Amino acid sequence: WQECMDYAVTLARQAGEVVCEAIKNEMNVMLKSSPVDLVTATDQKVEKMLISSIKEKYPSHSFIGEESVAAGEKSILTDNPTWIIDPIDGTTNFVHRFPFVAVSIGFAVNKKIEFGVVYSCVEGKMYTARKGKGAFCNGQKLQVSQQEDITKSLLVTELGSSRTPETVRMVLSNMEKLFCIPVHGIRSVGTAAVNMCLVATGGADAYYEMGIHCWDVAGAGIIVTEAGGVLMDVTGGPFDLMSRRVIAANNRILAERIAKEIQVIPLQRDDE
Amino acid sequence: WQECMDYAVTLARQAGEVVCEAIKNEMNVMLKSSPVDLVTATDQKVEKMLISSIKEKYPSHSFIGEESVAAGEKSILTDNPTWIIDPIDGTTNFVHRFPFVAVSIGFAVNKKIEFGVVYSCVEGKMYTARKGKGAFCNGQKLQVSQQEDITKSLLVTELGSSRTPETVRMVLSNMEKLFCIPVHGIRSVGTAAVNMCLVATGGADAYYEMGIHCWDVAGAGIIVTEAGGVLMDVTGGPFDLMSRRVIAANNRILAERIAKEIQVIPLQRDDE
Ligand SMILES: O=P([O-])([O-])O[C@@H]1[C@H](O)[C@H](O)[C@@H](O)[C@H](O)[C@H]1O
Ligand SMILES: O=P([O-])([O-])O[C@@H]1[C@H](O)[C@H](O)[C@@H](O)[C@H](O)[C@H]1O
Ligand SMILES: [Ca+2]
Ligand SMILES: [Ca+2]
Ligand SMILES: [Ca+2]
Ligand SMILES: [Ca+2]
Ligand SMILES: [Ca+2]
Ligand SMILES: [Ca+2]
Ligand SMILES: [Cl-]
Ligand SMILES: [Cl-]
């Protein structure tokens, strides 16, 4: 797998420069399922680049990509080596030139993530992790924080892609409960992968969100765990790559305290 | 005033050095008005260093410093050349190693801001702006976005320092109104100065918040305006550096719209 991983990094840095060059220019913004669900030509171009370059070196491997799924593909995970890709995580940020956009790649064999590569191109941070090998950012080994007291934690989360009054009110309600525990604060950088990568570095204590997809957490999840953290479903149950929900914390203590506070929003699984 | 400005940029970098060095070490985290209102020995020393270095060259100038005010000094602005200082804007981030901390310095004469210096030490970004000279970040001229459609804007704001149910509910409700207009999204990096600087670059279209202090925005405000932006009061009226309220936008079109949507949160002015 090291051959594939080293290849993924080269590919990530490559797709990374395409994105980071495109960000400097005027874009043609297009909508997908709503006026806030955006996509551009770069999202599509980069994804086709990645898939081709991968199936060119590894023709037997399967692929699960955000735009490919929107192109007609089904997001079904088998035991076969599968590349779970998100060409640009932070499309809205990308469109606005907000300094946080990443290229995310996850690789799963036997339905388990072997390695994850997350490239934050604007800042030039390459986050990588291989099962049992550790998590790193530009050669620097990562380690999650040791905070076990919720009232002294810094959390990260996003408001979501939905504008439905009920869904929104529930998200804000969950945000309120945690906020008033209280915790030191809540941050929102604009991308699931980076938010999680910040938890891995220890700059944030935990991340939680409902509404995400497999391509959002496939690369960063392994990075949090290899940094010493834990992944979990919002329900307190085990993490599920297709569940649309996740809690990426420094330790099990915060994860369960957070789970205890938030109310689940009904979501449709990616494998349905 | 240019001499003062040149001296300011130097002092800010020197302070930035100190802050960014301490951020990697063990620190004594103390409390101010509550368990979530923090301060560290670095906040205290950096301010003392700044005020002393300034008082040496310009002994006839006045100062307004967060920690000085906390120590008993009153935040009263006069027509005399006053240095409005925020040693560390983003103390909670500092304590958590969250990659966004800034040293802010605002210089006012006749109660108007002449220049501002904001140094984001972790990123090594020096934001500066003299009235009528333009705003720059590391020697590159800044310019706000041109979005006049609120439904395509990206806003930045913070949840605040209060955990009072009543207040937290107004903050989240104001957030709910803007989010469901809808807007493309809402971000929170954890520091008012940087949030405003991101608006000056165009990465975000507008920033708003009620609860900040004069030292939080004295430096970044001139950067937004010099970048082509506008500072406004939540009432839609002119900006009042001592009111605890602010709307820093790319243009008046968006600013007026935000002021229309949000509800005022009762607060004690800095001059009361
Ligand atoms: O659309 P995308 O920009 O690839 O990814 C989005 C980002 O990860 C965002 O932070 C998260 O809150 C959304 O749920 C995702 O869909
Ligand atoms: O305490 P400080 O970190 O210097 O300043 C705070 C930060 O700027 C924060 O982002 C803002 O939301 C608060 O209102 C400020 O008081
Ligand atoms: Ca998307
Ligand atoms: Ca994407
Ligand atoms: Ca994504
Ligand atoms: Ca403070
Ligand atoms: Ca401060
Ligand atoms: Ca501050
Ligand atoms: Cl905070
Ligand atoms: Cl958002």
Concatenated DSSP letters for A180-236? TTT-SEEEB-S-HHHHHHHHHHTSSSEEEEES--HHHHHHHHHHHHHTT-EEE-TTS
What torsion, rounded to 10 degrees, do the Cα atoms A231, A174, A75, A124 define? -60
Q: What share of chain B is helix, strand, coil (3-state, %, to 5)?
A: 35, 25, 40
Contact check, Cβ <8 Å, B180/A168: yes
Active site residue B88: yes
Neighbours of A84 (CB within 10 A): 26
Residue with tokens 């204590």, as numbered in its chain: A205
Task: Provide Rg for chain B, Cα atoms.
Answer: 17
Cα–Cα distance, B213 to B59 (Å, whole number): 25
A266: Cβ contacts below 8 Å, ≥ 6 apart:
none
Query: A237 φ, ψ to 5°?
Result: -80, 180
List the structure tokens of A179.
């906020």
Query: Looking at ligand 2, which atom is closest to the CA of residue B38?
Result: 1
Beta partners for residue A135, in sequence order: A129
Asked if A96 and B35 come within 8 Å (Cβ–Cβ), the reply is: no
Rounded to a whole number of angstroms, the distance from the CA of A121 to the nearest CA of chain B is 14
**A228 within ligand 1 shell (Cβ under 6 A):** no
DSSP-derived letter for residue B238 is B
Q: Does domain B1-142 have CATH number 3.30.540.10?
A: yes
Residue recorded with tokens 């919720």? A150
Nearest Cα residue to A136 out of A148, A144, A128: A128
Give chain B positions within 8 Å (CB) of A190: 185, 187
Which residue is catalytic, options B66, B158, B205, B226?
Answer: B66
Contacts of B200 (CB under 8 A, 6+ apart): B127, B129, B135, B137, B142, B144, B220, B223, B224, B226, B227, B229
Active site residue B216: yes
Secondary structure class of B96 (helix, strand, coil): helix
Percentages (nearest 5) of helix, strand, coil residues in chain A: 35, 25, 40
How far is Cα A143 from Cα A155, in angstroms, rounded to an integer?
16
Three-state SS at A130 = strand
Report the C-alpha gap between A238 and A231 in whole angstroms. 8
* B232 strand-pairing partners: B238, B247
If DSSP codes are grouped into helix, strand and coil, which group holds residue B18? Answer: helix
Query: ∠ CA A25-A29-A34 to the nearest 5 degrees?
Result: 155
In angstroms and rounded to an integer, the radius of gyration of the C-alpha atoms of chain A is 17
Task: Give residues after which chain B gaps, C-N over 2.5 angstroms.
Answer: none
Interface residue B32 vs chain A (CB under 8 A)? no
Q: Is A151 annotated as a binding residue?
A: no
- What does the angle CA B194 – CA B196 – CA B201 come to, to the nearest 5 degrees? 90
Q: Is A116 annotated as a binding residue?
A: no
Domain A143-271, CATH 3.40.190.80 — does that match? yes
The answer to whether A1-142 and A143-271 have equal CATH topology is no
Answer yes or no: are the C-beta atoms of B228 and B222 closer than 8 Å: no
Q: Which residue from B171, B212, B244, B268 has its CB within 8 A of the most atoms of ligand 2, so it is best to mutate?
A: B212
C-alpha span between A87 and A100 (Å, rounded): 14
The answer to whether the Cβ–Cβ distance between B180 and A198 falls below 8 Å is no
Q: What residues does B155 pair with on adjacent strands?
A: B186, B206
Hey, which residues does A141 pair with through a beta bridge? A136
Instruction: Note the maximum CA span of chain A.
Output: 52
Task: Give the type of residue at A146.
Answer: Q
Chain A residue nearest residue B98, CA to CA: A203
SS3 of chain A: the string is CHHHHHHHHHHHHHHHHHHHHHCCCCCCCEECCCCCCEECHHHHHHHHHHHHHHHHHCCCCEEEEHHHHHHCCCCCCCCCCEEEEEEEECHHHHHHCCCCCEEEEEEEECCEEEEEEEEECCCCEEEEEECCCEEEECCEECCCCCCCCHHHCEEECCCCCCCCHHHHHHHHHHHHHHHCCCCCEEEECCCHHHHHHHHHHCCCCEEEEECCCHHHHHHHHHHHHHCCCEEECCCCCCCCCCCCEEEEECCHHHHHHHHHHCCCCCCCCCCC
Rounded distance between C-alpha atoms, residue A36 and residue B104, angstroms: 34
Which of B40, B42, B91, B157 is labelled catalytic?
Answer: B91
What sign for the dihedral angle of Cα A67, A72, A75, A80? negative
With beta carbons less than 8 A apart as the criterion, state whether A171 and B179 touch. Answer: no
Quote the tokens at residue A129: 């992790």
* B260 three-state secondary structure: helix
Q: Please report the resolution in angstroms.
A: 2.5
Q: What are phi and psi of B5, to 5 degrees?
A: -60, -45
Cα distance between residue A167 and residue B260, in whole Å: 24
Residue A88 appears among annotated catalytic residues: yes
- Provide the CATH number for the domain formed by B143-272 in this structure: 3.40.190.80
In angstroms, what CA-CA distances link B129 with A14, A188, A233?
Answer: 36, 27, 47
Listed in sequence order, the DSSP H helices in chain B are 2-22, 41-57, 66-70, 91-96, 165-179, 192-201, 214-217, 220-226, 252-261
Phi–psi pair at B136, nearest 5 degrees: -140, 160
Q: Where are the domains of chain A?
A: 1-142, 143-271
Single-letter amino acid code for the residue at B132: G
With a CB cutoff of 8 Å and minimum separation 6, the contacts of B194 are B89, B90, B100, B102, B118, B120, B220
Asked whether the beta carbons of residue A172 and residue B175 sit closer than 8 angstroms, the reply is yes
Distance CA B255, CA B133 (A): 23
Residues that place a CB less than 5 A from ion ligand 9: A 185; B 92
Residue type, A256: E
Burial status of residue A158 (CB atoms within 10 A of its CB: 0-12, 13-18, 19 or more): buried
Report the C-alpha gap between A31 and B54 in whole angstroms: 53
Question: Which of A98, A145, A204 lies closest to B154 in CB terms?
Answer: A98
Q: Do A185 and B95 touch (CB under 8 A)?
A: no
**Of B43, B47, B67, B89, catalytic:** B89
What does the alpha-carbon distance between residue A51 and residue A132 come to, in Å, rounded to a whole number?
A: 26
Q: What would the two tokens of residue B190 be?
A: 């954890």
Crossing angle (nearest 10°) for helices B41-57 and B2-22: 160
What was the structure determination method? X-ray
For residue A22, what are the contacts with CB-CB under 8 A and spacing of at least 6? A40, A42, A94
Nearest CB to A179; choose among B123, B168, B176 = B168
Asked if residue A200 lies in contact with residue A102, where contact means CB atoms within 8 angstroms, the answer is no
Q: Which two tokens stand for residue A99?
A: 């300094």
